[PDB]
Structures are given as C-alpha cells and as structure tokens.
mmCIF file of C-alpha atoms and ligand atoms in Angstrom:
data_model
loop_
_atom_site.group_PDB
_atom_site.id
_atom_site.type_symbol
_atom_site.label_atom_id
_atom_site.label_comp_id
_atom_site.label_asym_id
_atom_site.label_seq_id
_atom_site.Cartn_x
_atom_site.Cartn_y
_atom_site.Cartn_z
ATOM 1 C CA UNK U 253 -19.621 15.303 33.067
ATOM 2 C CA UNK U 254 -20.398 16.220 36.685
ATOM 3 C CA UNK U 255 -19.585 12.653 37.764
ATOM 4 C CA UNK U 256 -15.880 12.816 36.892
ATOM 5 C CA UNK U 257 -12.986 14.542 38.624
ATOM 6 C CA UNK U 258 -10.123 15.095 36.157
ATOM 7 C CA UNK U 259 -6.825 13.948 37.689
ATOM 8 C CA UNK U 260 -4.348 14.545 34.879
ATOM 9 C CA UNK U 261 -4.060 14.743 31.120
ATOM 10 C CA UNK U 262 -2.917 11.414 29.608
ATOM 11 C CA UNK U 263 -2.528 12.492 26.016
ATOM 12 C CA UNK U 264 -4.038 13.567 22.739
ATOM 13 C CA UNK U 265 -5.741 10.826 20.778
ATOM 14 C CA UNK U 266 -6.808 10.760 17.121
ATOM 15 C CA UNK U 267 -10.278 12.127 17.889
ATOM 16 C CA UNK U 268 -9.978 13.856 21.260
ATOM 17 C CA UNK U 269 -8.118 14.534 24.477
ATOM 18 C CA UNK U 270 -7.741 11.739 27.031
ATOM 19 C CA UNK U 271 -7.782 12.403 30.795
ATOM 20 C CA UNK U 272 -7.219 10.204 33.812
ATOM 21 C CA UNK U 273 -10.330 10.780 35.938
ATOM 22 C CA UNK U 274 -12.134 9.531 39.042
ATOM 23 C CA UNK U 275 -15.840 8.706 39.231
ATOM 24 C CA UNK U 276 -17.158 11.012 41.982
ATOM 25 C CA UNK U 277 -19.756 8.403 43.032
ATOM 26 C CA UNK U 278 -18.015 5.016 42.760
ATOM 27 C CA UNK U 279 -14.415 6.261 43.154
ATOM 28 C CA UNK U 280 -13.494 4.247 40.040
ATOM 29 C CA UNK U 281 -10.374 5.474 38.200
ATOM 30 C CA UNK U 282 -10.911 5.640 34.443
ATOM 31 C CA UNK U 283 -9.519 7.024 31.190
ATOM 32 C CA UNK U 284 -11.914 9.636 29.873
ATOM 33 C CA UNK U 285 -11.816 10.476 26.159
ATOM 34 C CA UNK U 286 -13.577 13.679 25.222
ATOM 35 C CA UNK U 287 -14.494 13.980 21.536
ATOM 36 C CA UNK U 288 -15.963 17.181 20.039
ATOM 37 C CA UNK U 289 -19.095 15.758 18.327
ATOM 38 C CA UNK U 290 -23.585 11.924 14.165
ATOM 39 C CA UNK U 291 -26.177 9.283 15.072
ATOM 40 C CA UNK U 292 -24.643 6.374 13.093
ATOM 41 C CA UNK U 293 -21.391 6.886 15.065
ATOM 42 C CA UNK U 294 -23.247 6.674 18.405
ATOM 43 C CA UNK U 295 -25.021 3.466 17.366
ATOM 44 C CA UNK U 296 -21.726 1.871 16.274
ATOM 45 C CA UNK U 297 -19.719 2.915 19.318
ATOM 46 C CA UNK U 298 -22.485 1.932 21.767
ATOM 47 C CA UNK U 299 -22.355 -1.635 20.397
ATOM 48 C CA UNK U 300 -18.667 -1.807 21.379
ATOM 49 C CA UNK U 301 -19.787 -1.917 25.035
ATOM 50 C CA UNK U 302 -20.583 -5.600 24.471
ATOM 51 C CA UNK U 303 -17.225 -6.387 22.764
ATOM 52 C CA UNK U 304 -15.484 -7.526 25.945
ATOM 53 C CA UNK U 305 -12.240 -9.542 26.135
ATOM 54 C CA UNK U 306 -9.254 -9.533 28.510
ATOM 55 C CA UNK U 307 -6.960 -8.159 25.752
ATOM 56 C CA UNK U 308 -9.361 -5.340 24.716
ATOM 57 C CA UNK U 309 -9.480 -2.182 26.794
ATOM 58 C CA UNK U 310 -12.927 -2.166 28.419
ATOM 59 C CA UNK U 311 -15.376 0.487 27.256
ATOM 60 C CA UNK U 312 -17.314 1.249 30.448
ATOM 61 C CA UNK U 313 -19.698 3.926 29.141
ATOM 62 C CA UNK U 314 -20.564 6.126 26.185
ATOM 63 C CA UNK U 315 -21.947 9.520 27.234
ATOM 64 C CA UNK U 316 -23.359 11.788 24.505
ATOM 65 C CA UNK U 317 -24.113 15.222 25.938
ATOM 66 C CA UNK U 318 -24.000 18.893 24.830
ATOM 67 C CA UNK U 319 -22.521 17.990 21.410
ATOM 68 C CA UNK U 320 -19.575 16.217 23.018
ATOM 69 C CA UNK U 321 -19.000 12.488 23.074
ATOM 70 C CA UNK U 322 -17.325 11.058 26.172
ATOM 71 C CA UNK U 323 -15.914 7.549 26.093
ATOM 72 C CA UNK U 324 -15.166 6.080 29.512
ATOM 73 C CA UNK U 325 -12.509 3.352 29.396
ATOM 74 C CA UNK U 326 -10.714 1.220 31.917
ATOM 75 C CA UNK U 327 -7.443 2.899 32.922
ATOM 76 C CA UNK U 328 -4.075 1.322 32.172
ATOM 77 C CA UNK U 329 -0.887 2.948 33.410
ATOM 78 C CA UNK U 330 1.326 2.902 30.251
ATOM 79 C CA UNK U 331 1.390 2.450 26.451
ATOM 80 C CA UNK U 332 3.720 0.209 24.457
ATOM 81 C CA UNK U 333 5.378 3.165 22.740
ATOM 82 C CA UNK U 334 6.679 4.530 26.054
ATOM 83 C CA UNK U 335 7.795 1.035 27.119
ATOM 84 C CA UNK U 336 9.655 0.504 23.814
ATOM 85 C CA UNK U 337 11.386 3.891 24.203
ATOM 86 C CA UNK U 338 12.353 3.080 27.824
ATOM 87 C CA UNK U 339 13.693 -0.311 26.658
ATOM 88 C CA UNK U 340 15.767 1.215 23.806
ATOM 89 C CA UNK U 341 19.178 0.377 25.326
ATOM 90 C CA UNK U 342 18.566 -3.278 26.183
ATOM 91 C CA UNK U 343 15.495 -4.154 24.066
ATOM 92 C CA UNK U 344 12.351 -5.923 25.291
ATOM 93 C CA UNK U 345 13.246 -9.516 26.203
ATOM 94 C CA UNK U 346 12.062 -12.010 23.569
ATOM 95 C CA UNK U 347 9.848 -13.919 25.980
ATOM 96 C CA UNK U 348 7.949 -10.700 26.789
ATOM 97 C CA UNK U 349 7.729 -9.781 23.075
ATOM 98 C CA UNK U 350 6.305 -13.248 22.439
ATOM 99 C CA UNK U 351 3.802 -12.922 25.314
ATOM 100 C CA UNK U 352 2.651 -9.538 24.071
ATOM 101 C CA UNK U 353 2.247 -10.738 20.474
ATOM 102 C CA UNK U 354 0.320 -13.831 21.717
ATOM 103 C CA UNK U 355 -2.042 -11.680 23.762
ATOM 104 C CA UNK U 356 -2.573 -9.143 20.968
ATOM 105 C CA UNK U 357 -3.421 -11.953 18.553
ATOM 106 C CA UNK U 358 -6.026 -13.191 21.066
ATOM 107 C CA UNK U 359 -7.543 -9.714 21.143
ATOM 108 C CA UNK U 360 -7.639 -9.593 17.332
ATOM 109 C CA UNK U 361 -9.025 -13.132 17.056
ATOM 110 C CA UNK U 362 -11.862 -12.142 19.335
ATOM 111 C CA UNK U 363 -12.792 -8.875 17.608
ATOM 112 C CA UNK U 364 -12.394 -10.384 14.130
ATOM 113 C CA UNK U 365 -14.748 -13.257 15.103
ATOM 114 C CA UNK U 366 -17.371 -10.545 15.717
ATOM 115 C CA UNK U 367 -16.474 -8.837 12.399
ATOM 116 C CA UNK U 368 -15.030 -5.770 14.116
ATOM 117 C CA UNK U 369 -11.732 -4.384 12.788
ATOM 118 C CA UNK U 370 -9.401 -1.922 14.455
ATOM 119 C CA UNK U 371 -7.854 -0.453 11.270
ATOM 120 C CA UNK U 372 -5.355 1.855 13.032
ATOM 121 C CA UNK U 373 -3.185 -0.275 15.284
ATOM 122 C CA UNK U 374 -0.006 1.410 16.519
ATOM 123 C CA UNK U 375 2.189 1.224 19.645
ATOM 124 C CA UNK U 376 0.382 4.257 21.115
ATOM 125 C CA UNK U 377 -2.956 2.361 21.335
ATOM 126 C CA UNK U 378 -1.466 -0.789 22.876
ATOM 127 C CA UNK U 379 -1.676 -0.523 26.631
ATOM 128 C CA UNK U 380 0.235 -2.479 29.278
ATOM 129 C CA UNK U 381 0.056 -3.118 33.018
ATOM 130 C CA UNK U 382 2.644 -4.222 35.604
ATOM 131 C CA UNK U 383 1.341 -7.838 35.673
ATOM 132 C CA UNK U 384 2.323 -8.627 32.081
ATOM 133 C CA UNK U 385 -0.984 -7.969 30.278
ATOM 134 C CA UNK U 386 -1.298 -5.986 27.042
ATOM 135 C CA UNK U 387 -4.588 -4.691 25.613
ATOM 136 C CA UNK U 388 -5.805 -3.063 22.409
ATOM 137 C CA UNK U 389 -7.316 0.408 22.759
ATOM 138 C CA UNK U 390 -9.651 2.311 20.378
ATOM 139 C CA UNK U 391 -10.995 -0.865 18.747
ATOM 140 C CA UNK U 392 -13.939 -0.007 16.504
ATOM 141 C CA UNK U 393 -13.470 3.775 16.499
ATOM 142 C CA UNK U 394 -12.167 3.885 12.894
ATOM 143 C CA UNK U 395 -15.410 2.394 11.511
ATOM 144 C CA UNK U 396 -17.482 4.909 13.474
ATOM 145 C CA UNK U 397 -15.448 8.033 12.632
ATOM 146 C CA UNK U 398 -13.034 7.169 9.804
ATOM 147 C CA UNK U 399 -9.239 7.433 10.088
ATOM 148 C CA UNK U 400 -8.366 11.057 9.357
ATOM 149 C CA UNK U 401 -5.194 12.476 7.789
ATOM 150 C CA UNK U 402 -4.555 14.635 10.858
ATOM 151 C CA UNK U 403 -5.786 14.316 14.432
ATOM 152 C CA UNK U 404 -8.021 16.825 16.196
ATOM 153 C CA UNK U 405 -4.798 18.712 17.136
ATOM 154 C CA UNK U 406 -3.494 18.623 13.522
ATOM 155 C CA UNK U 407 -0.889 15.978 14.337
ATOM 156 C CA UNK U 408 -0.077 13.683 11.419
ATOM 157 C CA UNK U 409 -1.759 10.284 11.768
ATOM 158 C CA UNK U 410 1.046 7.766 11.297
ATOM 159 C CA UNK U 411 1.199 5.686 8.122
ATOM 160 C CA UNK U 412 3.876 3.302 9.420
ATOM 161 C CA UNK U 413 1.500 0.435 10.241
ATOM 162 C CA UNK U 414 -0.864 0.846 7.282
ATOM 163 C CA UNK U 415 -1.484 -2.210 5.101
ATOM 164 C CA UNK U 416 -0.637 -2.037 1.370
ATOM 165 C CA UNK U 417 -4.222 -2.617 0.229
ATOM 166 C CA UNK U 418 -5.257 0.583 2.047
ATOM 167 C CA UNK U 419 -2.351 2.543 0.531
ATOM 168 C CA UNK U 420 -3.303 1.244 -2.941
ATOM 169 C CA UNK U 421 -6.851 2.595 -2.561
ATOM 170 C CA UNK U 422 -9.011 -0.457 -1.819
ATOM 171 C CA UNK U 423 -12.347 0.618 -0.282
ATOM 172 C CA UNK U 424 -13.153 -2.712 1.354
ATOM 173 C CA UNK U 425 -10.715 -3.550 4.145
ATOM 174 C CA UNK U 426 -10.635 -7.003 5.640
ATOM 175 C CA UNK U 427 -9.465 -8.152 9.081
ATOM 176 C CA UNK U 428 -6.106 -8.749 7.359
ATOM 177 C CA UNK U 429 -5.276 -5.037 7.696
ATOM 178 C CA UNK U 430 -4.915 -5.538 11.469
ATOM 179 C CA UNK U 431 -2.582 -8.543 11.021
ATOM 180 C CA UNK U 432 -0.347 -6.388 8.809
ATOM 181 C CA UNK U 433 -0.199 -3.643 11.476
ATOM 182 C CA UNK U 434 0.575 -6.130 14.214
ATOM 183 C CA UNK U 435 3.377 -7.696 12.120
ATOM 184 C CA UNK U 436 4.944 -4.228 11.710
ATOM 185 C CA UNK U 437 4.709 -3.688 15.483
ATOM 186 C CA UNK U 438 6.214 -7.186 16.141
ATOM 187 C CA UNK U 439 9.189 -6.298 13.954
ATOM 188 C CA UNK U 440 9.576 -2.962 15.754
ATOM 189 C CA UNK U 441 9.687 -4.663 19.170
ATOM 190 C CA UNK U 442 12.366 -7.044 17.957
ATOM 191 C CA UNK U 443 14.653 -4.596 16.167
ATOM 192 C CA UNK U 444 14.007 -1.446 18.228
ATOM 193 C CA UNK U 445 13.331 0.518 15.028
ATOM 194 C CA UNK U 446 10.172 1.031 12.970
ATOM 195 C CA UNK U 447 9.981 -1.390 10.049
ATOM 196 C CA UNK U 448 8.450 0.976 7.445
ATOM 197 C CA UNK U 449 8.705 4.597 8.789
ATOM 198 C CA UNK U 450 7.056 6.306 5.790
ATOM 199 C CA UNK U 451 6.477 10.052 5.789
ATOM 200 C CA UNK U 452 3.930 10.162 2.967
ATOM 201 C CA UNK U 453 1.643 7.613 1.313
ATOM 202 C CA UNK U 454 4.103 7.028 -1.531
ATOM 203 C CA UNK U 455 7.134 6.893 0.771
ATOM 204 C CA UNK U 456 5.236 4.355 2.890
ATOM 205 C CA UNK U 457 4.448 2.219 -0.147
ATOM 206 C CA UNK U 458 7.965 2.415 -1.566
ATOM 207 C CA UNK U 459 9.492 1.465 1.829
ATOM 208 C CA UNK U 460 7.281 -1.616 1.834
ATOM 209 C CA UNK U 461 8.288 -2.415 -1.744
ATOM 210 C CA UNK U 462 12.039 -1.962 -1.058
ATOM 211 C CA UNK U 463 11.890 -4.657 1.654
ATOM 212 C CA UNK U 464 9.221 -7.056 0.448
ATOM 213 C CA UNK U 465 9.632 -6.586 -3.322
ATOM 214 C CA UNK U 466 7.371 -4.619 -5.624
ATOM 215 C CA UNK U 467 4.151 -6.641 -5.803
ATOM 216 C CA UNK U 468 3.000 -8.124 -9.083
ATOM 217 C CA UNK U 469 0.234 -10.423 -10.304
ATOM 218 C CA UNK U 470 2.332 -13.509 -9.357
ATOM 219 C CA UNK U 471 2.289 -12.744 -5.620
ATOM 220 C CA UNK U 472 -0.888 -10.660 -5.473
ATOM 221 C CA UNK U 473 -3.598 -11.406 -8.062
ATOM 222 C CA UNK U 474 -5.436 -8.246 -9.002
ATOM 223 C CA UNK U 475 -2.835 -5.833 -7.586
ATOM 224 C CA UNK U 476 -2.251 -4.115 -10.936
ATOM 225 C CA UNK U 477 -5.977 -3.230 -11.162
ATOM 226 C CA UNK U 478 -6.102 -1.468 -7.784
ATOM 227 C CA UNK U 479 -7.173 2.207 -7.812
ATOM 228 C CA UNK U 480 -3.807 3.763 -6.887
ATOM 229 C CA UNK U 481 -1.547 1.187 -8.513
ATOM 230 C CA UNK U 482 0.766 2.666 -11.183
ATOM 231 C CA UNK U 483 2.685 0.589 -13.718
ATOM 232 C CA UNK U 484 5.491 3.136 -13.246
ATOM 233 C CA UNK U 485 6.185 1.959 -9.678
ATOM 234 C CA UNK U 486 9.860 1.020 -9.493
ATOM 235 C CA UNK U 487 10.562 -2.734 -9.410
ATOM 236 C CA UNK U 488 12.548 -3.595 -6.290
ATOM 237 C CA UNK U 489 13.735 -7.102 -5.436
ATOM 238 C CA UNK U 490 12.588 -8.786 -2.257
ATOM 239 C CA UNK U 491 15.047 -8.890 0.665
ATOM 240 C CA UNK U 492 15.684 -11.884 2.940
ATOM 241 C CA UNK U 493 13.866 -11.737 6.300
ATOM 242 C CA UNK U 494 17.170 -12.707 7.884
ATOM 243 C CA UNK U 495 18.208 -9.104 7.108
ATOM 244 C CA UNK U 496 14.859 -7.561 8.116
ATOM 245 C CA UNK U 497 14.477 -8.743 11.724
ATOM 246 C CA UNK U 498 17.775 -10.008 13.069
ATOM 247 C CA UNK U 499 18.348 -11.743 15.416
ATOM 248 C CA UNK U 500 14.833 -13.217 15.426
ATOM 249 C CA UNK U 501 14.708 -17.061 15.173
ATOM 250 C CA UNK U 502 13.261 -19.048 12.239
ATOM 251 C CA UNK U 503 9.856 -19.607 13.911
ATOM 252 C CA UNK U 504 9.453 -15.856 14.487
ATOM 253 C CA UNK U 505 10.649 -15.017 10.964
ATOM 254 C CA UNK U 506 8.176 -17.555 9.538
ATOM 255 C CA UNK U 507 5.279 -16.039 11.480
ATOM 256 C CA UNK U 508 6.305 -12.475 10.566
ATOM 257 C CA UNK U 509 6.591 -13.373 6.860
ATOM 258 C CA UNK U 510 3.053 -14.796 6.937
ATOM 259 C CA UNK U 511 1.723 -11.663 8.699
ATOM 260 C CA UNK U 512 3.224 -9.506 5.936
ATOM 261 C CA UNK U 513 1.971 -11.408 2.879
ATOM 262 C CA UNK U 514 0.897 -8.893 0.251
ATOM 263 C CA UNK U 515 -2.310 -10.703 -0.726
ATOM 264 C CA UNK U 516 -4.777 -10.109 2.155
ATOM 265 C CA UNK U 517 -6.345 -13.500 1.321
ATOM 266 C CA UNK U 518 -3.034 -15.249 1.907
ATOM 267 C CA UNK U 519 -2.100 -13.248 5.010
ATOM 268 C CA UNK U 520 -2.290 -15.395 8.140
ATOM 269 C CA UNK U 521 -5.400 -14.953 10.322
ATOM 270 C CA UNK U 522 -5.177 -14.171 14.033
ATOM 271 C CA UNK U 523 -6.631 -17.606 14.845
ATOM 272 C CA UNK U 524 -4.072 -19.385 12.636
ATOM 273 C CA UNK U 525 -1.242 -17.257 14.060
ATOM 274 C CA UNK U 526 -2.135 -18.385 17.602
ATOM 275 C CA UNK U 527 -1.443 -21.990 16.500
ATOM 276 C CA UNK U 528 1.941 -21.108 14.988
ATOM 277 C CA UNK U 529 5.019 -22.964 16.375
ATOM 278 C CA UNK U 530 6.553 -19.656 17.544
ATOM 279 C CA UNK U 531 4.121 -19.825 20.489
ATOM 280 C CA UNK U 532 4.969 -23.403 21.529
ATOM 281 C CA UNK U 533 7.044 -22.091 24.501
ATOM 282 C CA UNK U 534 5.036 -18.923 25.230
ATOM 283 C CA UNK U 535 5.011 -17.734 28.840
ATOM 284 C CA UNK U 536 3.716 -14.665 30.690
ATOM 285 C CA UNK U 537 6.671 -12.685 32.088
ATOM 286 C CA UNK U 538 6.228 -9.506 34.113
ATOM 287 C CA UNK U 539 7.732 -6.376 32.560
ATOM 288 C CA UNK U 540 10.211 -3.803 33.767
HETATM 289 C C1 3QS A 895 -1.798 9.239 22.024
HETATM 290 O O1 3QS A 895 -1.672 9.580 23.408
HETATM 291 C C2 3QS A 895 -1.172 8.509 24.215
HETATM 292 C C3 3QS A 895 -0.314 9.032 25.379
HETATM 293 C C4 3QS A 895 0.272 7.837 26.155
HETATM 294 N N1 3QS A 895 -0.723 6.762 26.413
HETATM 295 C C5 3QS A 895 -1.039 6.477 27.738
HETATM 296 N N2 3QS A 895 -0.121 6.749 28.661
HETATM 297 C C6 3QS A 895 -0.334 6.493 29.954
HETATM 298 C C7 3QS A 895 -1.548 5.936 30.340
HETATM 299 C C8 3QS A 895 -2.507 5.659 29.356
HETATM 300 N N3 3QS A 895 -3.708 5.098 29.787
HETATM 301 C C9 3QS A 895 -4.833 4.789 29.011
HETATM 302 C C10 3QS A 895 -5.008 5.281 27.715
HETATM 303 C C11 3QS A 895 -6.145 4.936 27.000
HETATM 304 C C12 3QS A 895 -7.100 4.095 27.627
HETATM 305 C C13 3QS A 895 -8.170 3.908 26.642
HETATM 306 C C14 3QS A 895 -7.824 4.599 25.548
HETATM 307 N N4 3QS A 895 -6.616 5.235 25.742
HETATM 308 C C15 3QS A 895 -5.892 6.058 24.762
HETATM 309 C C16 3QS A 895 -5.101 5.106 23.823
HETATM 310 C C17 3QS A 895 -5.030 5.812 22.439
HETATM 311 C C18 3QS A 895 -5.819 7.142 22.620
HETATM 312 C C19 3QS A 895 -6.793 6.815 23.777
HETATM 313 C C20 3QS A 895 -6.855 3.637 28.928
HETATM 314 N N5 3QS A 895 -5.748 3.996 29.572
HETATM 315 N N6 3QS A 895 -2.224 5.943 28.073
HETATM 316 C C21 3QS A 895 -1.715 6.408 25.369
HETATM 317 C C22 3QS A 895 -2.333 7.678 24.781
#
C-alpha cells in the first residue's frame, strides 16, 4: 500500500507478518498486518470494523488489493507475553493481574454480546500500553480464516489455551471457549508458568485431565459421546486448586474454578465473571 511507510517488523502472526507503519498522509502510526490472500472472509472481517470497544484493538481499515489482504490496526507498544517474561523474577503484582483480567472480561463481554468469538486467545494477542490498559487483538479472525495447525511461517499454533470441547472434536464452539482460554492465561499470570503446556492434542487433553480430573457424565453430560472421546482415556483424580494456583486467594481460586468448568454450559460467562467478588477491590495500576 502506497500510503504506508514501514517502520519496523513487529512479528509474525498466525496468518501474516505484522509491521509498525506510518500513514504517509495522516502521519498516523499503525500496526499493519499483511496476509497472503476468499469473499466470505472479506465480508466477515469488514464487519469487525464496527466491533469497537476500549478493550478491543481497533481495526482501522481492511484493504484487499493484488491478492493480499492488509489489516490496519491501532498500534500498541507491547504484548502480554513479553511483559510476563520481563516480570519473571518478581511476578506481575496481583492488583495489575486483577485489572488486566477485569479489562479482558469487559472485552469478551462486549464481543460475546454481538455473538463474535475470538477462539484463539493467547498472551501474544493481548496488547498493553503504559497507562494500564490491555486489549484483545485478532478478534474475529478465526471465524473468517479458521485456526490452522501451523502459521504462515510453519510455526506451531499453540494448544495451551484450547478448551476441552475443541480438543474433543465438537464442531460448534460457544463463547465459553474464550472464557477457558482467559482462565488459563489468568493462571499463567499468577504462577509465572503455563497451566497446561501441551505439545500435542492428546498431551494437551491429558494435562487438563491430570489437573481437573478426567471428565465423565457426572460433571459433563454428553462428554462420552463427543467425536474424539475414547473410553480408554486414563482416569485421573481431580487436584485441589490450592495446589494449582498458589498463592492466589479464595476469591481468585473460585473465579478460576468457574472459568475452567468442563461443561461449557456451566462455565461462567464474561458478564457473570465481571460481577464476581474477586473484582470488589479492582483498581487500575500502571505497569512497569
Ligand atoms: C506474534 O507476534 C507478536 C510479536 C510481539 N507483539 C507485539 N509486540 C510489540 C508491539 C505489538 N504491537 C501491536 C501488535 C498487533 C496489533 C494488532 C494486532 N497485532 C498482532 C497481535 C497478534 C498478531 C497481530 C497492534 N499492535 N505487538 C504481538 C505480535
């Protein structure tokens, strides 16, 4: 696009390269995603231009030209993954964790109210600024393109935040899949280690089962009829959350437990999570 001066490469996304760029006319600084490209995808993505919220990265423009799709986003200076890594020695202070979770739930509540799911939440698509805001990036792209096994650069797309219903082969995802992912990220902020760092679909599932118990018809009606469910799955006992996310307090453990319910019908909604007692003393700290 003749209107954009590339400043520097930001990274490699799932679908294409991302550059920091400047608009040659307006001087606006943006994040420019270049995807090597489907008419249904364009329709779907174009409708995301109206899905505006303070905790969703703004989609400024969608430019389809010469069999390439450019997505022009607001620029944020850092992702949560880098912040977590830089905070590895001391950890992210609880009040900032709480603020971030609160804001992310607001973002989800908004998108879910418009029946738009993310489906591939991970620390790398959560973006932060120096004023204490956090925003969800790439919302809606999974419905338009699918979530592939490998990225455009052949990198493995992480399974760590994937909900069990997806792993077990359900074709119809609900908004609950995003609550699962956010619960995994919450736990990761608190403990400074990924909750379920699976390196294959079955390793991912068995890591979930080892912590939360192997699901059965008691806790998840219909689970044994799911496409990829096998009666031969080992039967692991459920662990206490006290062991899973120390030293998180009882309000946080309660919220996390409800975000990781097996049955997507039982899993807490973003709206209901915002009303949880964990947020009674929520503040908006500024990060290091
Ligand atoms: C997977 O590669 C990651 C590399 C590190 N990250 C990053 N570091 C600095 C600034 C920034 N700014 C930024 C990134 C943005 C947007 C809108 C979308 N993205 C990325 C997020 C996931 C892939 C597209 C706005 N600012 N992002 C996220 C992308």
